Write a structure and sequence with these properties.
3-stranded antiparallel sheet; 2 domains; 13% strand; binds 2-{[(4-methylphenyl)sulfonyl]amino}-4-phenoxybenzoic acid
Amino acid sequence: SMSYTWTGALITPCAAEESKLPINPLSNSLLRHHNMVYATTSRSASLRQKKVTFDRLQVLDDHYRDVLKEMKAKASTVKAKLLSIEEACKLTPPHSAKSKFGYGAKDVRNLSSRAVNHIRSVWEDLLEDTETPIDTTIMAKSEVFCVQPRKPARLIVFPDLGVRVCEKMALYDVVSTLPQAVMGSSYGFQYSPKQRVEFLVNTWKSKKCPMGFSYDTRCFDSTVTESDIRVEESIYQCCDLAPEARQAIRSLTERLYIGGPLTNSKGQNCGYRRCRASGVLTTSCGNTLTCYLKATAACRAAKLQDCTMLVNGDDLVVICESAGTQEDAAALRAFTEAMTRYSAPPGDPPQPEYDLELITSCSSNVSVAHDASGKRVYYLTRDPTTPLARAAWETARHTPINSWLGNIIMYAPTLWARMILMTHFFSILLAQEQLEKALDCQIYGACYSIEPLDLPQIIERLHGLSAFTLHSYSPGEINRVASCLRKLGVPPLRTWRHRARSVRAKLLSQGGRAATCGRYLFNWAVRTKLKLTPIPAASQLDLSGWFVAGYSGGDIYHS
Ligand SMILES: Cc1ccc(S(=O)(=O)Nc2cc(Oc3ccccc3)ccc2C(=O)O)cc1
């Protein structure tokens, strides 16, 4: 059926939308071509709607059913707990959209009488009503990019805060444990960026003659069918669940996940949805399962040999045994046809890759540099354009989420993050005197509050001490960065080194943790290096919960 139906009423903004980069003094030292940086607005909502609206086509076969059964089996071992209203409330971010029933985030987190009473009635209701389509709000997402040689805004659909908390109660544990129990080493969110690289590299080497590819499904969420969503629930239903939760899952499936009415910021009727909503708890888990499910079966239909999957929401990368160039290309083409029948048509057609570094999955790619010792070391990098366009924007305006702090944690090893992000942001903090101030940032969707002064410990635990000494990056990685800095108008190496060296001295003089950030973060800047020994604090970090599951659009905060 139609992924969407439109009444005519427009997708409205809930306040003035900023589309241009504010000519600012701190933004300019970072990037000069400020006219190349823009933020999507509801003004392009009509373009997106036209792209994500279509009639889906789905034909299921034996391979599909076979993989589903296999998945159902591993799911069968799972035992979901069910969170109490309190637990689910602690998971609610402080900046989470308030409810239309008289309360907001704060209240929820504070367990106020009015917050809990309503949330309880919404749950009681989920247990009693198994049919009434739950109302959702559709808004145009505001994201930052760099004009290309512009993207329409993304459309987000989320339910009320009351409903969001009940989802946590009945499905948090499910979406946190089932993917791994079901997909194994294929579930990409269980890995830290260093662990993701390792998995890719080890998998690449386990092949006599490796052949890999990334698969980009054209607007994946709209391709998800009502059938896919019930198949997804049937996987959840294999779990040992409390009666209240099993019913809650049954009700949420029919009343929210499979579809529902759409309302704009103005309380107007926008239309209907019959595909995946981006703003619910099961979106990441559901997408990962569905992509994995169809892909695994697509591989068997196409005769691809010994496939290894790595799934992250709707992002997928496969690595298998080559059967030669012709054969690989035909096999790949047969794969896309199987996927197209399973209702997951490609956006960018897929191309076979015989070199690990040229494979972009999760917007990233594996690459290689060298540690002080001269030894090779693989790390995860990515074109810096978007992270840089966003660093500029987050430097000019106050934003709930600091993508830059995220990008620095996830890409600490990369040449661009060490030379640009760390230098630009550490110098700024010093000036405003806020090196202590904790900042929120997201990792695989989950919200986290992080103290800038802890970056060193964080980086060593996640990437190893090498992230402080990598040098001699690849000629491929160097070009990409260079040609990007030119595009955006970012100062050259010399300028950043000079800036870094000053940021460093200023830090070292302060001593304490600041002295530590200086010593390790900017050791690449000075000639007279400093033996970088293991940071004590790092052996006392619990970064476990950081890499367990995906939560994008799931309204998750990890206090
Ligand atoms: C974090 C970082 C680490 C080492 C260095 S370096 O000055 O020791 N060497 C390099 C300096 C570069 O300068 C740039 C050239 C073009 C675009 C951006 C940077 C590029 C690559 C390397 C290297 O080690 O291979 C600079 C920044």
